[model samples]
Every structure is written in C-alpha cells, then in structure tokens.
Target: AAQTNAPWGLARISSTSPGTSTYYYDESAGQGSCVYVIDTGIEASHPEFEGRAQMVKTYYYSSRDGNGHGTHCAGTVGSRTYGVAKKTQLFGVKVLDDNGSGQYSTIIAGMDFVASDKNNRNCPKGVVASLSLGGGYSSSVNSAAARLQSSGVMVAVAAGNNNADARNYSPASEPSVCTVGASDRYDRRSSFSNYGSVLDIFGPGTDILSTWIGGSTRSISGTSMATPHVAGLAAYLMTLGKTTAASACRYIADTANKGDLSNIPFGTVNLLAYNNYQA
Candidate 1:
C-alpha cells in the first residue's frame, strides 16, 4: 500500500528538518538484516509485518503478544508501515511479560537466546537486538548485554523513562550497548526520558504510531518506543554492510545529526538518530 505521508518518526529521521512528510531510503532498505525484538513479543500476523515477523524464542506459554509493546516496537523497527528498516526481518524474543515487565533473569535469558542464535544456520546475518525495557542498575543484566554485543549482535537498549540520569540504569548504562533516549517531533527531548552521557542517541518516542496486537495500530510514547527506531536504523546500516556490532554502533552515533534537540539535559548527548536518508 502506498502511503500519503511518512510517519512522524520516519519522516523526522530521513529529513534534516522536522515536519518533512516524505521518507526516502536506499532501495534495498533492510533487505538482508534482522532485528530481534526483545520485548513482550510480536504479533507476526499483523499486516504491518508483511509476513516478515516471527516469534523464535519466548519464556511464556506462547509467543503471542498479549501486551502490545513488543509488536509496536517491532513495527517501529521494521514494519512495512511505520518502520525504519522497512524490509528487515523481525524475530520476536519475548523477554518482558504481558504486563510489560520482566525479571532480570528473564531478560538475560532473552539476550542469551539472541547471542546463541549465531549457531543457528537459518538465522540471518546483520542481527540487531531491540531491548525496550530497563530497570535500576544491575550488573548481571549489564554483563549479559555486553556479552550479547560481543557475540556480534548490535544491541539497542532504552534509557529508562524516569527523567533521570541513564547511568543509573543497567543495560542503558552499559557502554557496550547503544543506549537510546526519547525525543519529539519539534526537536525536544521528551520530559520523561532519561538523560546523561551514557545515552548513544535520541529517537522519536512521543506519540509514536505503530503496529499493535489484534491487527491494529496504536499511538504511544516512551523510551521503549525510541529504542527500536535506532534498532531499525542499526538493521538498515547492517544491510549496507556495517556487519559488525561495534561498527554499526559507531556508524549510528557518528552519523547521527548533532545538537538539534532542545530540552536536552546537561549530561545528555544532544545527537538525534538519523537514517541518513532524505526526501
């Protein structure tokens, strides 16, 4: 289906200025990359996914996305409708529970699954993990995330939405991960988004529209929403041959549009995530 205009988040990243309604990208988009959505889960059947989404690992009875967080994040990552990497494959890894919360052990297990998938011959190259949940600082989770990055998965984690320093959070604070904060359409850091030098980049997180469960679409906000946008961007970069996790992370941060956001806290990095596409 053709779209009359791009989604705000997609539009924001593709253009240097805000309010550009069109989105432009390389013809391949995310053709050869895959994003592992480490959240609640994903509705693979959602039209937005175009049959490219699947649940490969989960701790629940089923991989069904009872809560919509994972589905929405996956959409932002690679849905045909609202994604950054529109053609990337999405592998749902259910770490968070339906209530949108998870224990550190559960989350670590999800991260491990992605890392171990390197042995699976069927798994695609250029793998990226989208982690949209975070909590207070935990060395265990941080270590696992670092390990995942070392295993060749580009990890993008959300800075917690507590409107405080992101260095106090676990994987968000971990140097190995691409920690992301929330920004809005007018180049403003979201009021509730975590800040600090630990963050890698900011993406549109306010009033973001994406795929949901029950074959629907939803508009919501959080660092949860922003992380996957970077994850998608990572996927896109991977398709362009930034195959290594460190290279992809470095390219993302280095290529990001800088100093464009307002209301960025003193310690926060003012870089905005970009797809390096324009229309």
Candidate 2:
C-alpha cells in the first residue's frame, strides 16, 4: 500500500526545511484517539480533514478557525496529509479570538469545559487538549492544567517562541503540562525555540507546511507548530497503550532518543511524533 497523505516534517527534513522525500501515515496512527485544539478553533470543513474535524465547544466569539493558526495546528495534530495521527478524531475548542489572541481565562475555561465532557465522545478518560495559544505568567492556567491532569486529561502547550527559558512562561512552565519546543530540519534546535529546565519535548516546527483555514494549506514556524506534533502523538498513543495522560507523556519522554538536542532542557532530548509513534 502507498501513503494516502504525507508530511515532510514526519519524513524528516530536506533542504532548508522539511525534506522533500515523502511517506504516508503509520499503521498505528491515531486509530481510536481524540484530540482538542484549544486555540482559535479548527476549520471543520478543511478538505484535508474530510469530515473528521468537529467543533465540540467554543469559549470565544466564534468557533471557526479565524487566524488560521488554530487550523494549521489542528491539521498538524491529525489531518491526513499534515498530521502525526491521520485517523484521529479531532475536536475544536475556541479560546483565541479572530486575531489569534486569547487570555488565560478563556484558555483555562476552554480546557475545563472540554474536560467536563471527557469519555463521552467514544474516548476513554479525556481528550488530549493541544494548547498553542498565548505565552506569559498565569497561575490560573497552570492550576487548570493540574486539575485537568488529575482528572486524567492531558494538556500539551508550546514552549514560548522567545528563545528564553520556558520557566518565565505560564503553561509552558507548568509542572502538570507537556511543554514542547521547536526542532529544525537539521535535527538542531530552532533558533527561535525556548529551552529551560521545565521543557519536556521537542518537535518539528520550522518552515513546516500544514492545513490552513479556507480548505487550503500553508507553511509556518514556531514552537506553536511543534506543540501539535506531540499533542497528536499523545492522543495516538493513548488508544494503543490504554494509558492515561500523565503516563503517556512520561512514556514519550522516557522512550525518546535522548542527548541529541543540544539546547534541550535538562540535557534531555526526544524524537518527533511520526518518527517514534510506534505501538
């Protein structure tokens, strides 16, 4: 069988970005997993997503993917072409506004709301909530993650794009969250990626192309992009391992190929989603 859809980032990098060589979805890709892109929202009608994308709830002015950031991250999470887990059931929770900005209040509100509906959509414990929103200090957001984690819900947030230590950021530095940083095609840390003792994992984020709003596709950058790779990976693993959110995050960290990323926090390292999403 041939690959139905392929993402360059998953095949590793080529040129100055993801490699030109392509591959398809893995056999174990998002078989029975669920994920929530807790950002602006997801363009549920994107052709790449087929009919798999759903808008389960909204805490913003609209549940539509407006800035395209949420849609792109959602694509990377589980679209057939640009995602880590192709067969995943993707849900959207709008927290960010049309301008791609949202406060921790709405962010946490969305997560808590989503967590409240866990195990209802044919999911086990809770949906793997992927947070690619704002950066800063917010105890409420961190507390929400802690509460969600204890409830068996996993939240994946991107390390800030500022290249500074993630400790200064809110959800990125939260103890209960899975903090992800950016990786380039060369296997080196992205110049813009933030590193710190609080960082948990790294994923492909530079010059990466993914499904965008309006049923199109585009390339973008940032740890915001890398965060989804891990989010989708976590969801993909949940169904196979019958694992909880915390255990899945630890399993991913524990099984990753370490010591490869020079800037990785605590001298720890790991591979991207597709490379190591094996059962």
Candidate 3:
C-alpha cells in the first residue's frame, strides 16, 4: 500500500507535512485487531465494510444505524478506502438512539459488552473501542470506561466539539481514557474542537471524508471523527505488540509528530496522530 492515493486525512498522517495525497503503510497493517464502534450503531451492509462490519450488540431492538454517526466513525476505523486500520474487524455496539443521544446507563452497557467480548477466548487479541460520544461530567460512565481499559481494552474517547476545555466533559476528561482532539489539513486545530491538558492527542477531522449511510460518502467535522482515527491507530499498534491501553497510548504520544499543530489552546499538548508510515 505504498504511495497509494488516499483521503487527505489518511495521507496527512503518513507524512511529516501535509502536502502529499499518497498513503504508505504495510499491506497487512491491521490484520489481527478489532475495533468496537460504540455509537449509534453502523450500517453493517454498507459496501465500504465488505462484510467486515457486524452488529454485535445493541441497546435498541432495531439494530439499525439511523443517525449515521456511528456508520461514518466505523468507516474511519476500518473501511477499506477511508479507514486507518483497513483490515481490522468492526463491531457495531449500538448504544445511542436514532438521534445520536444516549444515557449513561446505555453507554455503560455498551462498554460492558465490549469487555465481555474481549474476554471471549476466540476473539482477536487486539481489542479496541471507539467512543465518539460524550457529555457533562459523569462519574458512572467515566468509571465504566476506566474499568474497561483496566480490563485490557484500549478506549479512544472524543474530546468533544464545544470549542472549550475538554476537562469539563465526562469520558473525555477521564484520565484513564485516550482523549483525542481534532485538527485540520494545514496542521491547525479545528475551530470547534475542544482542548485542554486532558486531551491526549489530535487527529485529522475538519472536512474529513469517509463512508456514510446509504452506501455513499460524506464529509464532516468534529472530535468524534478524530477519536476513531486514533482508535484505528491503537488497533494497529496492538497488532505490533502494544497490547495494553497504556502502551498503545504511550506509543501514540511518543511517535506522534510533535509541535506541528497550530491554533491549539495555550498549554495544550500539540501531538498529531501518525501510523508509523513515513512518506
């Protein structure tokens, strides 16, 4: 997969600068990993998934991705054309309702399901979860995410899109989670992305294109979009032996292109996500 045309966000992460339109990586980059999309669920039948996406668990009876947020995020995590870990298995954990909103109890239930699946002896060794949803400070969801990470699942949470300090949010503020912020193609922070000391890293998000519902493509912006890029990278790192959440987070921070982002809040760490591919 070297020097192949790809999405701008994917191309940007593989290089030190943002001038290239080609992505470089091992062809088998994400062969032995799985990522759980804990959002509004995913369109498992979407052509982008190629049968790799499945509705493993759902809070609602329908198991449909009515809101489309989860489907887009899932594509970013594992779809062939728009994903970071192109071969990673994608599991749709439907917690949020059709409106893309859910309660703490439902979200916690999603986390519980991910943990239970990770405990399955036959599941992939590299287990990760992408959480693109968050809310006000809630100890219950925070603790659930923390417990999930403690049980060996890497949790990637969004830093929110409030354009404020991420510490005011629940799972994003939780120290145990890998909180991700949003950056644009020119190495600038997305105007609406939250920032703070709690933010662990940044990813391409503004005007990002990925698979959408109805077997189409769409462009959108938000920290929600950024979290899955990191989640995909986390799964890739796990395939490289960074099995623990702490190890994966540390590797991402250490390998990130440092001090490249502009317009971030004062004192916020400036680390952009990379996939160990240098072009």
Candidate 4:
C-alpha cells in the first residue's frame, strides 16, 4: 500500500481509480512545503493533525479554532487523511473572528508575515497562502497578494460563493494570484460559485467531506471549500521542486484538467487538481 487515500477533491477529477491513486508515485506528499491559512484559526490539538498546529499570526482572535472555519480549511490543506498535502507545515494566521468577520488590513499583514517568516527553519520554503475568504477588492490586501507572489509565495484564493463574476472581488479579481472557483462532482461550475474569466481553477466543493473542528468531520459548500484543493496542489508542487510561484502556477495549469466543463467558450477547462505530479 504505497498510496494515500484519494482526497475527495482528487477523486472528483482524476481519471485513475482510488485503489492505487497516482499520488502514490508523487514522492513529495508536500513533505517539505509550507502552507499558510489566513482565517479563523486552527484546532491545535485536533487528532486529524498529528499534534498541535503551528500558529504564525493571531490578532482578531487567539490562536484557536474558535469557529472551526480555519481548522476545516487547514484540514483540507494538510491533515493526515482529509488533506491533499499530507505533510506540509501548516500555519494558521488569525484574520477573522469566530463569526468569520475581519478587516482586510489583517489579511495584508498575514501575507507579509507568511512571506518573511522563517521560524528558525521550521518553515524552509517560501510559503503557500491559502485564503478561502473573499470580498470587494482591497487595494492593500490585493497588493499584498501580488507582492507575495512576486516574492515567490504561492497564493490560492476563493472566487467567492456569490455566483456573480469573480472580477468584482479582491484576491480573486487580483491578477497573478491563483484564484479558484467551485465545481460539483460532475465538474460543472457550481451555481453558487462566482465565475468568469478571472477564475484560475475549479475543484470539487459541493457536499465535500473533510476534517472539521473539535476532532470531527463534516461537509460544507462554497467556492471557499474549493480553494484549498489548489493550495494543497501548489504545496505539493513546491515540495517537488517547482519552487517559483509563477512556475508552480504554470505546472498547476498545464498538468491540471478541464474535466466535464464543456461549456467554457473555447478549449478552456477549469483546472483539475489531481494526484498527477510530474517528474
């Protein structure tokens, strides 16, 4: 059994079966990569996580998964079973509260922290910023994301759950950052997902199951739920030596798939983040 459980997000897109996922050949299960989650916070003691989580920034609230949103997102990013990158250095940066509301400036601060964080070698690679939150464009936050990408940090953001054009939002609207939209098992864009030319990729988000807060598991919906699939992929790419942000993004797009998204005007297909890492 040299394989890992195909994360539902992966199974929804890969052509291969689940029994011996192509992921088994991916030597880098994100082992040396680092993923940053800018959200509510993480459940440091969750069993899904081997031990406690590594908290890098906490401001709106203490470093705990008070609302479970951050923890759940972290799970999708790098938990033992519920994650895409099973061995990444997951750091939770608290930007939102238990109610999931926060200032955009906080997110900007988090981007800066993640980019420059060294933690005495605890996190060696640059960083993968996983943001499942979105709103109207913030000149500051958007700039931060762009700047981080310029500095070699891989960023993944949700295209929002508003079903409207993602061009109207921030990080998703922001150029260069990896923007993600949601799709169901059929690979059809989810009606609730914001879509448009701005989306960089799509992933299974509907009724998707994963590690939840309080050592539990549950299913949630939204483009927010879809963002982590790409983050996990980007993290694994970094571990595989696709270190540059732009280079990793290109690998993601090229090696990714369009699946059943047959309605995209041209040969365009939403990015399929499966276990297909290249040598």
lDDT of 3 by residue, 107-180 (tens): 99889889888765344547888999999988888999998888888899999999999888989989988999
lDDT of 2 by residue, 111-207 (tens): 7887787756786533688888657877888888777777777788898899888888878878778888888876778889888777777888888
Model 1 agreement with the true structure over 207-267: per-residue lDDT tens digits: 9999999999989999989999899888887787754666777788788889999998786
TM-score of each: 0.96, 0.89, 0.96, 0.89
lDDT of 2 at 135: 76
Alpha-carbon local distance difference test for all models: 0.87, 0.76, 0.87, 0.74
The window of 10 residues in a row where model 1 has the poorest summed lDDT is 117-126
- Residue 108, model 2: Cα distance from true site in angstroms: 1.5
lDDT of 4 by residue, 172-207 (tens): 888789888787766567778887887777776777
Q: Where does model 4 exceed 4 Å of error?
A: 1-7, 16-27, 118-120, 262-269, 277-279
What is the overall TM-score of model 2 with all chains considered together? 0.89
Off by over 4 Å in 1: 1-4, 121-125
Q: RMSD to the native, candidate 4? A: 2.8
